[PDB]
C-alpha cells in the first residue's frame, strides 16, 4: 500500500526529492518538461521554453564542500568552485549512485494539480501532464514541487521611459550566452545582481564599453577569501555563527563592510550603496575591481530615460552610441499548475518553513527549493526532501494552521526589517539558521555537546571547521555510515585540486 | 655649432629622449626603423619585424600618476590603470604638447654606429641608416640609443626535448594576440612573468583547460591595492622606502610575502617558489588566484619532455592530447648596430647607471631605457635623458674608466646576490632608489629637508604620499612651474575616473 509521489522538475531539488521519497520508501513518479536532468545547471547555445536559461562561462559561487548533498561528496579532484558543466556532470553522478533516472519520464509537462473530491480525508492530488501533445489524468497520495525559480524573466521595461523609442539591441540577461556579439561595441547592463556583474566583467573583454548601471549600489564579496580558502567554508562555520550572534547585526555587518572595503572602497568605486551588508542578497565578483580600476567597467547610477542612441542617467549624467542594453533585472516565480493550492504576487508566498502551504487539510504538497540562502539550495532542497516525506508517511506532523501563519508572518515581518525592499528579497534564507532548522524537524540535528565527550576530534571539526552539509547525515533517520569519515577529510578535499605541483 | 644628437627609437624613450635634447639646446635627428611612434605599445593584429610585439588586451601594471612624464601628468580622466590604446594616445600627446614628431624620420633603420678616425679629441660617431633600401651616412656628436628590450624572443627550445616532435602549435608570447585561436583546446603556458600570467587567465575563458607550468614558481601581486588605491602608489612612496630601510630586506620580505598569502596562500595554491619577493621581478596578476580556485587555470611544475601527443612534468605528472603550447620565455636584447663598442651576451652588458659605456673616451654614447624597474620606465628614461644630454655638453661629468668599472661590478655582484639567477634578472632596478640615483647625477632631487621648513604641506605629499615622478621637476635645471600644484591635486587624478556615479 506504497504510497505514489509526484515529483515535479528534475534539477538537484527534483533529484533528491526521488532520493528522499526511495529512503522511506514511497515510490516517486517524476515529471521533468524536457529531455534531461540538471534543470537550470544543463547549459543549452539557445534558451528552452519553461526551463532555467544560464550563460556558456558561470561559475558556481558557493564551494564544493558547501554545496554537496550530504550522503554524496563531490569528487576530491573536482575544483572548489565548479564551473556549470561539473555541477551537470555531478548530478549525473549522483542520479547513477542512486538509480533515479528510471524513475524520471522525460518531455512531459504538468499543467495541474488539483486536490480531488476525497481530499480532506484522502489528502490526494489530480495531476494533469502532456507529453507530445497527448493529456494523462493519474492521482497522487503526495506532490514534491520542484520547478526552479530563476525561469521567468522579470523584465521591468515600464520603469525605462524611452526603451520603446531605443533603435540597438536590448533583451533580459537570460538570452545573454556569450560576447561575441559586443566586440568594439558599447554596452549597458541594468542590475547588479550576480547577472549583472557576471556580463558586465565578461562583456568588457570584448566591448569598447560597458556602463554597469545600479539604482542602489552593491557590497561586493570575493569567493577567494582569507589565504585563498573559499570565504563560505569561513563564514558557514558554527564558530563565526556563534561570533556573529554574541556580537549582534549592526557590528557584524561593520566587520563584513570594513573587510570588503580593505579589498576595494565601495564609496571610492562608486558602487557603495544606503544599506548593510546582510540587508542585500550577496553579490559575488571577485575580477570586478579589476574591470572598474581600468575603465572598461564604468559604475553608473539608474537609467532613467533612453532616446534612440542613448541612456539618461537619474544624476543628469549622459552616455551617447549605445549599441546594446541588457537587463540582468532578475527573475520571479509562480504555478500555473497550482492556482487553486499555492498563490504568488510579486514573489511573495506563504509557506510553513518555505515548504509547506499552511491551509491545507493534509500535509501531502512539498514546495521543494524555494528558498535564496546565504549558501547553497540543493543541501537545502534535500533536507526540506527528507522532513516533506516524513510527514507525508505522519512520521512527524505540522502545527495548526493558525500557529503556522503566525511563524510565516513572523518570519516575512524580519525579512522585511532586515532585506531591502524588493521582490528578489522575498524568500532570503541563511545556510546554518536554515540546515538546523530543517534537521531539527528530521530528528538529524547532530547532537554537538555530547560528542564534545563521546569523540572530541569529531566535535572540533563540526564547530572549529566548515558547517559542511555531510554534518547531518551523523545521526538520525538517515545516518550515513561513511559521515565521520568524510567530515574530517574534508581538508584534504579542499586542496587536493590546488596542489598540482609540489611545494614542500 | 649647437651639437647634433642621433635619437635611436621613438617609443616612450626615443620621443622623451628628443624632448631632453630641445630642452638643452642641442638639434635632435632621431631614427625610428617602423612607420609611427610608440614602439610596444602601438598594437597592431600582426607582429612587426625588429619592433616588440603584444597582446590586444594588454593593461599596464604601473599606476598614470607612477609612470607619467615628470612635466606631462595623464589627464584626469584617464583610468589609474591604462589600457595599451590609452598608453599609446598619451604618446601621441606628449608629441604634440612638445612638438617631437618633425624630428622622426619615420622607416629608417640604424644598421651600423661607430666612434669616428677623430674620436679621441671630436667625440663623433659615423651612423648609417638604410630607408627603403637606399644607404645615408651622417656624423653626430652624440647618439640616445633607445631600441627597446622586449623585442628580441627568447625560445629557449634546446630545454625542452622532445618539442621538435610535439604535433600541436606552438610559439612565443610575441606571436599570442587573442584567444579566439585556442577556443574547446589544452593549452600549456611555459613561464610566470606578466605574459604568462596575462595568457593563463586570458586563454581560459575560451580554451577547455590550461596549464601554467612554472619551473620555480612566483610571488603573485594584486594591482588592486589596500582600499582600491594602486598598489605601487602605495609600495613607492618615501615612507615606505624609509620604513623598509630600517628593517632590512628578510623583514620588508616577510611582510610582502605575508601580505601575498593573506590574498591566496601560495602554498595551497601550489605556486611557492624557494625564493623571496624581491628576489624575482614582480608577477602582477589580481584575476589569477580566481582562475586556479576554478580548474580553468591548473598550476604545474616545468615540462621535461614533449611526445606528439603530451608533456611530461619534473614531478613525471602527464598532461595528455595537448593541442598548443606558448612559450612566455621572455626577450634579450642586443645591439647589431654597435657591436663594435657595446657588448652583451645572455642579456649581461657592463653600463655605468645602466647608461654609459665605461671605455669611452668621450661620453657622447648613452643607452636609454636599458633596465627593469619595480616600477614605470618611461619616468627612468627621461632622468636618463635629462642626465645624458647634461654629460653631452660639459655641464655633468662622469667618474675616471677604473671607478666606473668597481660601481659597475658592485652592481652586477649585489644583483646576482639579490635577484634568482636568469637572463631577465640582468638589469633590475628599483623605482625610488633608481629615480633619487639619476636625480641627485642631473642636480633635481627635491630637497625634503629645506622644504620640511620653507613649506610643510608640500613636503608632507612628498614623503607620506606617492613618490610620484613630478617630484623631479620642483627644483633644479629643468624646474616645473604647474609641478607643486599637480603634486598636491595627485589624489583628486586617481579618484577623478572612479567616482562616475553619485555617493552623498
Ligand atoms: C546564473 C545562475 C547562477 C546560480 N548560481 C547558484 C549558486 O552558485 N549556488 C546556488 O546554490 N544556487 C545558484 N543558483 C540558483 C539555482 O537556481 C540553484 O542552484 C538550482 O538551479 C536549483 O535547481 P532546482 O532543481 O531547484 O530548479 P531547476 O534547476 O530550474 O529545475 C527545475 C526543473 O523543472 C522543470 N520544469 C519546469 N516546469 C515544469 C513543469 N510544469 N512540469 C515539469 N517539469 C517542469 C524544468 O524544466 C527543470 O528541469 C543560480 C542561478 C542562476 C540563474
Ligand atoms: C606586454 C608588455 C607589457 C609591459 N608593461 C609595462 C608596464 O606596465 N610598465 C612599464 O614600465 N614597462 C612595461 N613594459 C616594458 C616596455 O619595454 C616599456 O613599457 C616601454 O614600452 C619601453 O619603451 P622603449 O622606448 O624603451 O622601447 P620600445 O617601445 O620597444 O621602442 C623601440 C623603438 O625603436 C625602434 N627601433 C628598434 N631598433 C631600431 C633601429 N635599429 N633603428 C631604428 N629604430 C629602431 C622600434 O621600431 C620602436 O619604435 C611592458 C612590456 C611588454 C612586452
Ligand atoms: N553562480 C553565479 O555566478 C551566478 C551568476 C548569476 C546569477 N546567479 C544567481 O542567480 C540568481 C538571480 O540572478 P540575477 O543576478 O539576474 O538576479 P537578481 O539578484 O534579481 O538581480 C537583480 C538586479 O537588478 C536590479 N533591478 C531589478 N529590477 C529593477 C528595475 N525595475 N529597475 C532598475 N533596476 C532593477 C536589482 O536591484 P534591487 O536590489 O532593487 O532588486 C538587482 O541589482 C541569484 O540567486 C544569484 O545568486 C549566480
Ligand atoms: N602590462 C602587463 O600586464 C605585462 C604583460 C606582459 C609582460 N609585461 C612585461 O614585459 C616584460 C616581459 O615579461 P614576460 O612574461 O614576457 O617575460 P619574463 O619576465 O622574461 O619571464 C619569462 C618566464 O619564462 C621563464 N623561462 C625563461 N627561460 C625558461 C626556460 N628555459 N625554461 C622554462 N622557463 C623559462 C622565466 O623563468 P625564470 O624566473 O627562470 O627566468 C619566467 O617565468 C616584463 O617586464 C613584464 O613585466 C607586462
Ligand atoms: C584580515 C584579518 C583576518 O581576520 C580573520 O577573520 C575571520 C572571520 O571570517 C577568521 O577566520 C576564520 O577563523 C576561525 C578559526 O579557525 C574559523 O572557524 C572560521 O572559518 C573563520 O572565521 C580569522 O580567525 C580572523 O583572523
Ligand atoms: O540574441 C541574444 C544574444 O545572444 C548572444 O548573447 C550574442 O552575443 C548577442 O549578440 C545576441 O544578441
Ligand atoms: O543590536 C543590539 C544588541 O544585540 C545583541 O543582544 C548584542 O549582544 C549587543 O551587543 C547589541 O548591542
Redesign the interface.
Given at each position: 500500500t506504497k504510497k505514489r509521489i509526484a515529483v515535479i522538475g528534475a534539477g538537484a531539488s527534483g533529484l533528491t526529492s526521488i532520493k528522499c521519497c526511495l529512503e522511506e520508501g514511497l515510490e516517486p513518479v517524476c515529471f521533468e518538461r524536457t529531455d534531461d536532468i540538471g534543470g537550470l545547471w544543463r547549459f543549452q547555445e539557445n534558451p528552452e521554453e519553461g526551463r532555467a536559461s544560464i550563460y556558456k562561462?558561470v561559475?558556481i559561487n558557493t564551494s564544493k564542500e558547501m554545496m554537496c548533498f550530504s550522503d554524496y561528496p563531490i569528487p576530491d579532484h573536482?575544483?572548489?568552485?565548479?564551473?556549470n558543466s561539473?555541477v551537470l556532470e555531478y548530478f549525473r553522478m549522483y542520479a547513477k549512485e542512486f538509480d533515479l533516472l528510471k524513475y524520471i519520464q522525460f518531455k512531459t509537462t504538468v499543467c495541474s494539480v488539483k486536490k480531488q473530491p476525497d481530499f480532506s480525508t484522502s489528502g490526494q492530488w489530480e495531476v494533469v501532464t502532456e507529453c507530445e501533445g497527448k493529456k494523462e489524468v493519474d492521482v497522487f497520495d503526495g506532490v514534491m514541487v520542484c520547478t526552479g525559480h530563476h525561469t521567468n524573466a522579470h523584465l521591468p521595461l515600464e520603469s525605462f521611459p524611452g526603451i520603446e523609442k531605443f533603435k540597438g539591441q536590448y533583451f533580459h540577461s537570460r538570452d545573454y550566452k556569450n560576447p561575441e556579439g559586443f566586440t568594439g561595441k558599447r554596452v549597458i547592463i541594468i542590475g547588479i545582481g550576480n547577472s549583472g556583474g557576471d556580463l558586465a566583467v565578461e562583456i568588457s573583454?570584448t566591448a569598447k564599453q560597458v556602463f554597469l548601471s545600479?539604482r542602489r549600489?552593491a557590497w561586493i564579496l570575493?569567493?577567494?577569501g582569507?589565504?585563498?580558502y573559499?570565504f563560505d567554508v569561513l563564514f558557514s562555520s558554527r564558530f563565526t555563527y556563534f561570533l556573529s550572534k554574541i556580537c549582534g547585526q549592526s557590528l557584524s555587518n561593520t566587520f563584513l563592510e570594513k573587510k570588503m572595503?580593505?579589498?576595494?572602497?565601495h564609496?571610492?568605486?562608486?558602487?557603495?550603496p544606503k544599506h548593510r551588508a546582510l540587508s542585500q542578497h550577496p553579490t559575488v565578483n571577485?575580477?570586478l575591481?579589476?574591470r572598474?580600476?581600468?575603465?572598461?567597467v564604468?559604475?553608473?547610477?539608474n537609467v532613467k530615460e533612453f532616446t534612440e542612441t542613448a541612456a539618461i542617467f537619474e544624476?543628469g549624467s549622459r552616455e551617447d552610441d549605445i549599441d546594446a542594453v541588457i537587463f540582468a533585472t532578475g527573475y520571479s516565480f509562480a504555478f500555473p499548475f497550482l492556482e487553486d493550492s499555492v498563490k504568488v504576487v510579486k514573489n511573495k508566498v506563504s509557506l510553513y518553513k518555505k515548504v509547506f502551504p499552511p491551509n491545507l487539510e493534509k500535509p501531502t504538497l512539498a514546495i521543494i527549493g524555494l528558498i535564496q540562502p546565504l549558501g547553497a539550495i540543493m543541501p537545502i532542497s534535500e533536507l526540506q526532501g527528507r522532513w516533506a516525506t516524513q510527514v507525508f508517511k505522519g512520521l512527524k506532523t505540522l502545527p495548526s494552521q493558525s500557529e503556522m501563519m503566525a511563524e510565516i508572518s513572523k518570519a516575512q515581518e524580519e525579512m522585511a526589517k532586515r532585506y531591502v525592499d524588493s521582490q528578489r528579497h522575498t524568500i532570503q534564507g541563511d545556510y546554518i539558521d536554515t540546515m538546523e532548522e530543517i534537521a531539527d524537524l528530521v530528528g538529524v540535528r547532530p547532537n554537538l555537546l555530547s560528542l564534545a565527550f563521546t569523540d572530541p576530534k569529531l566535535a572540533l571539526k563540526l564547530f572549529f571547521g566548515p558547517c559542511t552539509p555531510v554534518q547531518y547525515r551523523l545521526q538520525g533517520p538517515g545516518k550515513w555510515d561513511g559521515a565521520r569519515k568524510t567530515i574530517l577529510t574534508t581538508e584534504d578535499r579542499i586542496?587536493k585540486?590546488?596542489?598540482?605541483?609540489?611545494?614542500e
Open positions: 562561462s561559475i573536482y575544483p572548489n568552485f565548479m564551473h561539473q573583454h545600479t549600489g570575493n569567493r577567494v582569507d589565504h585563498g573559499p572595503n580593505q579589498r576595494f572602497d564609496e571610492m568605486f562608486g558602487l557603495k571577485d575580477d575591481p579589476n572598474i580600476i581600468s575603465g572598461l564604468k559604475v553608473k547610477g544624476d586542496r585540486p590546488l596542489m598540482t605541483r609540489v611545494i
